[PDB]
Amino acid sequence: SSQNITEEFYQSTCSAVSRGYFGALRTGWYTSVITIELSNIKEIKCNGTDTKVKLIKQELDKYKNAVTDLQLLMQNGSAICSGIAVCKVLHLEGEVNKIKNALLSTNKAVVSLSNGVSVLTFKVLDLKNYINNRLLPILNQQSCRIPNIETVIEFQQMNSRLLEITREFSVNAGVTTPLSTYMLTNSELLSLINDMPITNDQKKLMSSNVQIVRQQSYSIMCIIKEEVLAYVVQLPIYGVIDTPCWKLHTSPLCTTNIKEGSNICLTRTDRGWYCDNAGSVSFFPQADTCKVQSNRVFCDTMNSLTLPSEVSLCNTDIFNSKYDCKIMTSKTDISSSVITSLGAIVSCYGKTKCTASNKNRGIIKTFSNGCDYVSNKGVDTVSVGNTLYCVNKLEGQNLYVKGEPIINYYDPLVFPSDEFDASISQVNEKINQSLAFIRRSDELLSAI
Amino acid sequence: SSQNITEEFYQSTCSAVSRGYFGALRTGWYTSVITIELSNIKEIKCNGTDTKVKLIKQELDKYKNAVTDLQLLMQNGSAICSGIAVCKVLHLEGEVNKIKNALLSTNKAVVSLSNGVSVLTFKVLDLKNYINNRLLPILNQQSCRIPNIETVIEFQQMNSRLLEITREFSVNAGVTTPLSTYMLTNSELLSLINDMPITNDQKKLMSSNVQIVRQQSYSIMCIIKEEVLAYVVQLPIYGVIDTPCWKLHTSPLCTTNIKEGSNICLTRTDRGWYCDNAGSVSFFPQADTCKVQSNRVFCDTMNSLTLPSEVSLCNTDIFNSKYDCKIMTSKTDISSSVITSLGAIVSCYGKTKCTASNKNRGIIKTFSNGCDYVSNKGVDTVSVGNTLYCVNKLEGQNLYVKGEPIINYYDPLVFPSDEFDASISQVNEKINQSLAFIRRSDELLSAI
Amino acid sequence: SSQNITEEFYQSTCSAVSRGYFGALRTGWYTSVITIELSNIKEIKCNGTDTKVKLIKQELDKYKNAVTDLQLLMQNGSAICSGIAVCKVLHLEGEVNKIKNALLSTNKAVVSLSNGVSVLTFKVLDLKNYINNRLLPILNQQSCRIPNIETVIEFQQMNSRLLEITREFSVNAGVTTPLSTYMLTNSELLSLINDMPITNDQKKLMSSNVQIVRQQSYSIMCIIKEEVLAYVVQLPIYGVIDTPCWKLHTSPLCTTNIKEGSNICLTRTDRGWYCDNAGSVSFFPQADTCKVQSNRVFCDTMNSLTLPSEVSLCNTDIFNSKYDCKIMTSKTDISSSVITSLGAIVSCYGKTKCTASNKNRGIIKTFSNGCDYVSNKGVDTVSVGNTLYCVNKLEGQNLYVKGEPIINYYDPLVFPSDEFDASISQVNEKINQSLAFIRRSDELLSAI
Amino acid sequence: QIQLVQSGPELKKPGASVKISCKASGYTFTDYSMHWLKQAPGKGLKWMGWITTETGEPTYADDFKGRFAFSLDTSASTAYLQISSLKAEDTGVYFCARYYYGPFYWGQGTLVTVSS
Amino acid sequence: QIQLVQSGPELKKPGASVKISCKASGYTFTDYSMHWLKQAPGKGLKWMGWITTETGEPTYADDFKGRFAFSLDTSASTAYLQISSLKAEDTGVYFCARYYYGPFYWGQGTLVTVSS
Amino acid sequence: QIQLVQSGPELKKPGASVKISCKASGYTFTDYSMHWLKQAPGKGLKWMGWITTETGEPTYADDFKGRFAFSLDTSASTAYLQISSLKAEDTGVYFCARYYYGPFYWGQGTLVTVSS
Amino acid sequence: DIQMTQSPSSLSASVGDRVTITCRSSGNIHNFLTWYQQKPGKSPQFLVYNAKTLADGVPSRFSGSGSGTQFTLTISSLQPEDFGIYYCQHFWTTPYTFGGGTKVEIK
Amino acid sequence: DIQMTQSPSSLSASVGDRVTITCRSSGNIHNFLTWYQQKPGKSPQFLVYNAKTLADGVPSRFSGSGSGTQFTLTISSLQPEDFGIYYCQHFWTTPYTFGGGTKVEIK
Amino acid sequence: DIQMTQSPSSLSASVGDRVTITCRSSGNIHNFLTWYQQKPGKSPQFLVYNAKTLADGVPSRFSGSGSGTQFTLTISSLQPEDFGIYYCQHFWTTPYTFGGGTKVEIK
């Protein structure tokens, strides 16, 4: 998969749209139950004064405090409804019994719930076995004896994972995200990936990049009873694979040169990644939804604003009647440089001076009063105002698709629609009603 | 205390108010001084090359760096004025002497300050004793000897708490919140709770839920001098107990069905918990102030907006003249589902399709163009737009107190007051002045 | 350097400007390369069942997972362009070879890059040496043997730093800030400070306060190849030293007393520190840029808004024509108390009651309907509304430079410019055009 | 090593009340729930229902609703069944059981005899 | 094991200046503050005040203001008192003290004698 | 203990193709890059360029562009050079080298002879 | 409810017989089946955890197999210390139903 | 200021006497009282940390009691190695005031 | 490109001579210079890591000095086991250039 990213900068709306990114949208979750076999050990009647026995004593006290804290949290979006439903189903009496029966001899098993859902199961940690077989026997009677420092060190190391799990759940109040390493190890995550009910393409894609999956997954709390701590991990699946996806970097373009004192501007409301889903283009407004890795983007349809297929008409012709666009219309003149994948827009405006830069050639270009565009070839740093923005070092088929600014068509007598964030047709309605205001004002004056 | 929560959804303002919650407001703090007896140990003249001696050497270096960092922070709302005053009082010369004199023989004591305040005192950690009695003696002369791995492990474990305290205070810049486990252990917190100057009811309530107290408490830094590290822990008290408290979930209700293209909406400014305080209802606007646990809510009067007793008139009759209400008036049509305690409001509006769901029965209900309400009985998941919201599984005396939408009374010729966040009387003034605008416009036209 | 802070409160704009603070602006970075010599150890063919051998096995597994995770992040503002350029230069083939050649025998060296930049270099951690000399030899053949618990404890302690580095870079996605202790120790940071290419004044200033430098510095990731993990630390330099710098605390001043129902207000847009830079005053709008320590402030010119020398004219005479000021003009009446260095402004307005307080003397002052000012002498706590604000205990030459409120000059017939955040000249234009609106309205009425 | 001990046998008359108690020792009583079983004389084994040893909310099979009720005292680690409105069909044995790694685990039986 | 050592005795005339120094060894000099005491001949023990061994700001009792001043050199771990404008009432002993777990801890006395 | 092993010598005719392979054993092949050197008969040592053993993008010296190309198989830990369009100047030796703490590290030479 | 019945209601075998007991279910249960060994005048105990996992302390002669609806035990060799009434009971969901009782005897 | 005075200004006891010394205060001090044993021509040292906590290295014959305003020492048995001038001094707040001096003697 | 040449193209010394070899550079290189010991019909190996750091396993007689443009080796004593062709090569940047070859001989 060669990284053939082709960005095309536009001078019409001064929005640069990348291309060549093969995305992978997520349409659902896969809830699996992960159980830690806790042990409810009563306060031992040990009166030893040795350092090792004492250390085992505060470690057991820490374990008991962690268990009590877990019970304390157990007392009280689609991001968590599947896990919540699984927890509620597992709260039914007998489901824990079936889970333990299935996992009696195997660390992995498939259990069918009462309502019909079949969930994969794991046994990441075995604290009950280790405790009842090592700590309880020797440290049982009135005489206390622990002669192995290896034993206490091993107990510290193993109980550490439970301690971090309790800490993360306490701070995050029962639901954690992203899936930390402590909750599910990389090897265990890979093993669960291999057992997923999907084809080999999705399995290979989700195996290649595992940190992305960790970022997009979740973790819940269900129940601590019958000496079992079960937390459901909501790993995702990707129904659509390698769909053509494109970023839509935008930048505020302000008036022709700079009219001294005040004037308009029109940046493009919609930014972030776009993707094609079953003939309808998906849209992601938030930056934290879609994550980039190499030449392929990973997204999340949790709050994706599904759009029709005519979205691509916005880029090539903003004033197309086949599709409806949108542009935030403001009045603030700030020089900015939206860094893109294979370039950098620069809206040098007003008094501030902006110049391209190179480490070896020094300053090689000087901007003007317009949203100009600078390629990544021959440029490594862009200096705008008082700050310096690094220009990506990636190589791609850059295309300066120039045109004319859309500002010139707007009426120069007045520039209405201050601080507006609606569709372009609505902005046409706004300019229409503002010039209706002005025509009725002047006709009333003439009638007077 | 049976959880008899009774939610009553309204169709007038489409705001669902829960009931049956017995709150507990906090009206003040209780500053107590917690001292860690540090030891100022000079750089030892040890030239051993053994692994254990070396490890003790970097552990002592870590301890010295932590002490120096603490001195570095010591160099430079009502959330912290009591603790600040206690620190300033303890900065007077001789107060540390009295604290050490009192705590010479007992881990707990009561010390009266110079200005008159009496503060409980603790000695959580004894680093000076352990250091001067174990590390200094053997590791004193030119010959270095540490034959016990238990000793170095114990020193690591004990110095770990000081290391985390230093880290938390360094990141949080001298004041930390919430009270972490490292600063005060659960057992020590309970012990200080038992010694609080309050009745047994407040003590029992604050003992039953300790994580809530940890969330609402604080921690400060005062002074590191005379080989003492004293940090003041601001645990709270709850003057009023079991007052009737009610949540006031709200939702945006938009125009009758959906008028094609644009129209108004009126969500209720005030949300969050409410409580009764000495005959006057307290109001909490922020979500992070009041925390819920089982059927009782815990709140904080640090920034609570105290209100008169007529606040309950807002719910039953929004247009009551006895009390003044408030409604944010907007123009944006977004379908939303504010999940409540025993239900889920759904303002399905416009093109988007919203339907209730059940895991076993599938889709059982279809919404319409209005802020409808769905009970928790027979419904487990609500699907609105592109996301699925879990509906609480709690059981309570739900009451669909229906009525008529308040939108219909508003003038359909124009819908003024865009993006307004004032009282309902002020919105009446706004509609009055807008229709004054329109009447003077039309009368001027007729005069012309 | 005596702390002779002199605050002068004003009654004209009710903005209190501190003085006597000697700042230190940062104008550039100093990128240095810090390398950790990793070891690429293959999966050992060890079949031992002892606890110590097993523990070494999961520790080596953790190390390998950390290395793989580092490679995973390696796969994919002026805050980071210098470090990015250094990483790209080091990505050239042969630069790592030169770095290793230079650091073959010395833990510190100076290396000149291909493009001309000379960067100081470090070797903080030597994992390859320890691994290949201790873990590989004994744990090489089919027979496994580790008889020293000291060895495994030392390995855990040393690998801990790499584990935290990997964790911080994974959560922060390759770039971390502030510079944590794990990335660069205090001793190593001081050693690099002593080797900085600056005079002794800047070196002494940056040595005196090291936590400030840690807060303002950065850390990057470049490359993991040729058994080397190199991350560039961007420590700053301070070109200008001890420039006169002044804070500019502001407060919302509302109408004369309180006109019942509604009226205007005018707080001062610009807050935060100010500093003099080569005859032109620098301005810092954000709170997180400039940090205070004792009587000297430390700042950062990353986004500082450079201003001409006439900025001081804003304080003494707001309506001066030599310089342009700015005032946010609102309509919301909220009682607030902006705590200053040697005082506390209090804008007690409306129904709420605000009173000064003292711990021993009780309430000693009652405010009125105006932005009054209270000195730190004789006052320790200020109670406004429902919350109590601590008044700084610092001592300085307070100066109550009183005058007359600027509100009275504004037209009482109407108070335009709601929610405006522009220059004072622009607000004069706004009131001019609003009263133009009103004059044309009344003249049209008379013409009718 | 988990031992569940029940009460002793009884011989009584219809219309009165029977109290049969099971005490659980060997584990913390909060988590594991208590389950009650019926054995008819010579027939198979019925199933009453369950009582939760954490809260105290029981659920009854449709056959055994109306006359049987279990209550427990978590302080004493004992759970007892009160059988009011005795019928002649009450003859049989009673069993207290819990979930132990799959199937149930029953203690010793308590013969109940109904005379006239 | 904390030892505080003062200077030696002096015999001088009124109107001149007396320098008496106390050196503290056994602990870091920054934290613990230095306190100075007066002993009148045959009478009780007065209290001068304190000088902070961290910053250097002293505070004086109303009786002992005007003529007495303490200064310290933290580098040498020594604190000394300079007594200008000597009066005949200066006869007595001088003590350097610190706060050691409640009460004070005084070193050996330095007899000061005033002749004519 | 790092050992680099190359292929054997060859004697062939102009116009055909020569395949010479170097196998690296002793370290992971991904990070360390492969470098190729020329030795003229009796003259000094030229430098071809480098091929990266991580991605596979080579860079060639201006002298040695057009006829020489290196390719590698990371699975087999072997990198081989294919020499098409043989000229009589191809006589000499071939060396495979890597960066080992400063200077290069070359394996044994492979004599190439051109006949007619 | 899921009704469970046993075909060999009354069984009588010799000392060296390989006896086989089958249980049927009205519905489909994924394993979740166990058996009990009722001694006369005593309290029965389990011997097979699931359809194919024998319990600890049970002789290896006992063992089981089957999934879905048909489940069946395997006894390698009868031993006179083993005699009583055998019942089978599922635990898929409440309510819980037992079989008719396999009264094994001696020929 | 808090003035502190001692009732037995001059005391003379035998070798086997149980002597008692009392100190009064103008104000109320919560404990915060100590005593000193001045040897002639030497430097005195403390012997009781607070009102009721004897110092280390002091014979157990010494001990104290009292809170608020009235404070008093307890000496189990006089020992001829113990003789000098005794003073009492509070440390509630600055300024610091001593007593009149208990000049204990030998009968 | 940086061209590197050697002055003693052909050298012939006795068994107890202290021989000196110099290399020049067209440009300025901060150290980054090494030498190789080519044996006839074999593969040469490095002996000096940088301008002044001898390699491991090389006799201490070898050593080097110089920075910038002029670089020079130091041989304490010739030993008959050491004979061949010596070349010098920089590694400042690509492309990589060698010298003319110091063909050391025996007098």
- Domain ranges for chain B: 8-24+244-438, 28-237
Under 8 Å CB-to-CB from G44, ≥6 apart: which residues? D106, G36, G37, G38, G84, G85, G87
DSSP string, B209-228: --HHHHHH--B---EE-SS-
Min Cα distance B47 → chain E (Å) is: 23
Q: List, in order, residues 6 or more apart from A334 with CB less than 8 Å away.
A: A252, A349
Given its phi and psi angles, is residue B381 left (phi above 0), alpha (psi -120 to 50 degrees) or beta?
beta
Amino acid at B228: V
Cβ within 8 Å of residue A17, ≥6 positions away:
A7, A8, A10, A246, A247, A248, A249, A315
Put simply, the answer to whether A93 touches D33 (Cβ < 8 Å) is yes
3-state class of D65 per DSSP? coil
Beta strands in C367-415 (DSSP E): 370-375, 381-384, 387-390, 399-401
- What is the phi/psi pair of residue F44, to 5°? -80, -165
Query: How close is the nearest chain I Cα to the Cα of F94, in Å?
Result: 10
Q: Which CATH number fits domain I4-106: 1.10.10.10, 2.60.40.10, 1.10.287.3510, 2.40.10.340?
A: 2.60.40.10
* Residue B284: CB atoms within 10 Å: 26
Cβ neighbours, 10 Å, residue A61? 14
Which residue does chain A place closest to C445, by CA atoms? A448
Interface with F, mutate which of C40, C67, C90, C97 (most F CBs under 10 A): C97
Length of chain F counted residue by residue: 116
Q: Does B446 touch chain A (CB under 8 A)?
A: no
Check C52 against A386: CB less than 8 A apart.
Answer: no
- Using CA coordinates, name the residue in chain A closest to B388: A78
Are the beta carbons of C18 and C249 closer than 8 angstroms? yes
Nearest CA among B342, B404, B422 for reference residue B5: B342
Q: How many CA atoms lie within 13 A of A386 on its CB side?
A: 15
Give, for C138, the enclosing helix (H) or strand (E). helix C136-138
Nearest residue to D110 via CA among D97, D93, D96: D93
Interatomic CA distance for residues B343 and B389, integer angstroms: 11
Q: How far is CA G86 from CA C305, F49, G1, G8, G34, in A?
A: 88, 82, 21, 10, 10
Q: Give the nearest chain E residue to B92 (CA atoms).
A: E52
| Nearest partner of F62 among F48, F73, F82, judged by Cα | F48
Enumerate the β-bridge partners of residue A244.
A22
Q: How far is CA C132 from CA C38, C71, C157, H90, in A?
A: 10, 21, 17, 66
H or E stretch at E82 = strand E78-83
Q: Name the packing angle between helices A149-172 and C51-75 (round to 10°).
A: 40
Instruction: Compare all CA atoms of chain D with the CA of G40 and give the residue at the minimum distance.
Output: D42
| I89 DSSP assignment | E
What are the helix and strand counts (H, E) for chain B?
11, 22
Q: Are A51 and B155 in contact (CB under 8 A)?
A: no
Interface touch E47/H87, C-beta < 8 Å:
no
Token code pair at residue A287: 């930056």
Residue A319 to residue A435: CA distance in whole angstroms: 20
Strand order in the sheet with A223-224: A108-112, A118-126, A28-37, A229-237, A223-224
CA distance B217 to B179: 6
I65, containing H or E segment: strand I62-65
Q: Which two tokens stand for residue C215?
A: 């807060």
The single residue listed with the structure tokens 């915060």 is: H32
CATH topology of domain E17-109: Immunoglobulin-like (2.60.40)
> Is the CB of residue H52 less than 8 Å from the CB of residue B105?
no
DSSP string, F20-69: EEEEEESS-TTTSPEEEEEE-SSS-EEEEEEE-SSS--EEE-GGG-SSEE
Strands F68-73 and F78-83: antiparallel
Tell me the nearest-neighbour CA distance from H20 into chain E, angstroms: 20
Residues counted in chain D: 116
- Which residue of chain H has the CA closest to E102? H49
Q: How far apart are CA B447 and CA C445, in angstroms?
A: 10
Could you give the 3-state DSSP secondary structure of residue A134? helix
Q: Are B120 and B195 within 8 A, CB to CB?
A: yes
Which among B52, B78, B88 has CB closest to C388? Answer: B78
- Three-class SS state of C219: strand
Task: Establish if F106 touches chain I: CB-CB under 8 angstroms.
Answer: yes
Q: Is the peptide bond before H95 cis (omega within 30 degrees of 0)?
A: yes
Search chain E and give the residue with CA nearest H34. Answer: E103
- For residue B98, the surrounding DSSP H or E stretch is helix B95-102
Q: Is C101 on the interface with I (CB under 8 A)?
A: yes
Q: Kindly report the number of other CB atoms within 10 A of residue B350's CB atom.
A: 15
Tokens of I97: 């250039």
Of the candidates G43, G53, G95, the beta carbon closest to that of D61 is on: G95
Report the candidate in A15, A31, A228 with the shortest Cα–Cα distance to residue A111.
Answer: A31
- Which residues on chain D are in Cβ contact (under 8 Å) with A40? 27-28, 31
DSSP string, H16-28: T-----EEEESS-
Question: Is the Cα torsion angle H45, H51, H55, H59 positive or negative in sign?
Answer: positive
Query: Distance between alpha carbon B47 and the CA centroid of its chain, in Å?
Result: 52
How far is the C-alpha of C424 from the C-alpha of D18, rounded, in Å? Answer: 90
Q: Which of E15, E19, E4 lies closest to E71, judged by CA? A: E19
CB burial of residue C106 (10 Å; 0-12, 13-18, 19+)? exposed
Structure determined by: cryo-EM
Whether H42 and E109 lie within 8 Å, measured CB to CB:
yes
Strand D68-73 relative to strand D92-99, pairing: unpaired
Residue of I nearest to F96 (CA): I43
Contact D59 G94 (CB under 8 A): yes
Of the candidates B261, B228, B248, B264, the one whose C-alpha atom is nearest the C-alpha of residue B325 is B248
Distance between alpha carbon B13 and the CA centroid of its chain, in Å? 28
C225, F102: Cβ pair inside 8 Å? Answer: no
What does residue B128 show for φ and ψ, rounded to 5 degrees? -60, -45
The alpha carbon of residue H105 is apart from the nearest alpha carbon of chain B, in Å, by 31
Nearest Cα neighbor of C220 from C290, C266, C168, C256 is C168
For chain C, the straight-line distance linking the first and the last C-alpha, in angstroms and rounded, comes to 73
Buried b (16+ CB within 10 A) or exposed e, A238-247: bebbebebbb
Q: Is B169 buried (19+), middle (13-18) or exposed (0-12) by CB count in 10 A? A: buried
Please indicate whether, in this complex, the C-beta atoms of B40 and E31 are within 8 angstroms of each other.
yes
Q: CA E62, CA E59: separation in Å to the nearest integer?
A: 10
Please enumerate in sequence order all residues whose Cβ is within 8 A of that of B441, keeping only pairs 6 or more positions apart, or say none.
none
Question: Of C174, C197, C180, C159, which is closest to residue C32 (Cα–Cα)?
Answer: C197
Are B225 and E31 a contacting pair at CB < 8 A?
yes
| Integer CA distances (angstroms), B92 to B237, C295, H29, in order | 27, 22, 17
Closest CA relative to residue A30, chosen from A238, A202, A230: A238
Chain E residues whose CB is inside 8 A of the H50 CB are 102
**H92 contacts in chain B (CB < 8 Å):** 114
> How many whole angstroms separate alpha carbon D76 and alpha carbon C419?
68
The four Cα atoms E15, E19, E20, E23 give a dihedral, to 10 degrees, of: 170
Q: CB contact, 8 Å: A98 with chain G?
A: yes
C-beta atoms of G45 and D44 within 8 A: no
Question: In whole angstroms, what is the distance from residue F114 CA to residue F40 CA?
Answer: 13
**Domain F3-104, second-level architecture:** Sandwich (2.60)
Q: Residue B203: enclosing H or E segment and its boundaries?
A: helix B200-208
Q: Record the tokens describing residue A317, joined without a space.
A: 């012709």
Which two tokens mark I15?
Answer: 């068994």
Query: G35 and G47 in contact (C-beta within 8 Å)?
Result: yes
Task: Report the DSSP pairing between strands F10-12 and F110-114.
Answer: parallel
CATH code of the domain made up of D3-106 = 2.60.40.10
Residue D53 identity: T
Neighbours of G5 (CB within 10 A): 14
Distance CA A93, CA D96 (A): 16
Cα–Cα dist A280/A437, whole Å = 39
D107 touches chain G (CB under 8 A): yes
- The amino acid occupying position B330 is S
CA distances from C21 to B226, C4, C210, C290, C294 (A): 31, 8, 19, 12, 9
G30/A101 CB distance under 8 A: no
Residue A36: strand pairing partners? A229
Task: Please state the φ and ψ torsions of residue B242, each to the nearest 5 degrees.
Answer: 60, 30
- How many residues would you count in chain I? 107
Residue type for F3, please? Q
Nearest chain D alpha carbon to A92? D52
Name which of A40, A96, A100 is nearest D28 (Cβ-Cβ). A40
HSE-up (13 A, CA, CB side) for residue E89: 7
Chain C, 219 to 248: residues with Cβ < 8 Å from chain F are 225-227
What is the torsion angle, in degrees rounded to the nearest 10, for the CA atoms of residue C353, residue C359, residue C365 and residue C370?
-50
- Here the tokens at position A338 are 């939206």
List phi, psi (to 5°) of E70. -105, 140
Beta bridge partners of C281: C276
